[PDB]
Amino acid sequence: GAMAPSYRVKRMDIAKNDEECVVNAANPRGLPGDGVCKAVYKKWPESFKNSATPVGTAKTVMCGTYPVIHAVGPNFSNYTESEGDRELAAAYREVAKEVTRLGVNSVAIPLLSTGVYSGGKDRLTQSLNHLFTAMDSTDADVVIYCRDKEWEKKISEAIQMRT
Ligand SMILES: Nc1nnc2ccccn12
Numbered sequence: 804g805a806m807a808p809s810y811r812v813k814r815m816d817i818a819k820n821d822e823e824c825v826v827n828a829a830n831p832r833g834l835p836g837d838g839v840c841k842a843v844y845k846k847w848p849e850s851f852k853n854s855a856t857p858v859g860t861a862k863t864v865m866c867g868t869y870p871v872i873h874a875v876g877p878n879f880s881n882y883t884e885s886e887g888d889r890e891l892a893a894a895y896r897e898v899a900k901e902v903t904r905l906g907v908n909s910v911a912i913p914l915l916s917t918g919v920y921s922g923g924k925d926r927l928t929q930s931l932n933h934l935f936t937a938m939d940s941t942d943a944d945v946v947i948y949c950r951d952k953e954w955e956k957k958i959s960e961a962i963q964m965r966t
């Protein structure tokens with residue numbers, strides 16, 4: 804575990820993370836995809852061997868000794884708000900199990916279902932709160948990776964609020 808487990812946020816490419824493992828915002832078929840998934844495919848292509856897994860699950864594949872946790876959030880274009888909310892919560896619970904099983908002291912994580920799976924809605928608060936529900940009982944240092952400056956500010960404020 805980390806000596807004083809923390810949450811941090813950084814605005815940069817998750818493929819350049821400084822953590823002991825990465826969470827991919829994966830599609831269920833293990834395809835290269837776009838966004839986080841495509842940068843992850845370019846950085847760790849070996850990790851996409853038998854990475855396909857259902858919505859609401861996480862499957863870890865090693866790239867050398869570096870663990871890539873493929874976490875499949877729901878595409879809110881396809882799910883009802885209610886069913887999507889349940890699957891998004893479940894994907895993060897499966898991430899917490901994998902991070903714990905791997906015995907890592909740190910993990911790089913994107914906000915699942917906030918990009919091309921958002922069904923065109925702002926899901927910063929919904930996705931971040933499900934991340935906290937899952938990860939709060941783990942002792943890994945969590946570093947959240949985001950793209951836009953307003954998202955970095957809002958994620959940083961939500962972390963600082965609970966400290
Ligand atoms: N994950 C994330 N970071 N910045 C943004 C901006 C829009 C939608 C999702 N985002």
Ligand SMILES: [Cl-]
Nearest residue numbers: 814815816819
């Ligand atoms: Cl960058």
Ligand SMILES: [Cl-]
Nearest residue numbers: 917918919920
């Ligand atoms: Cl997404």
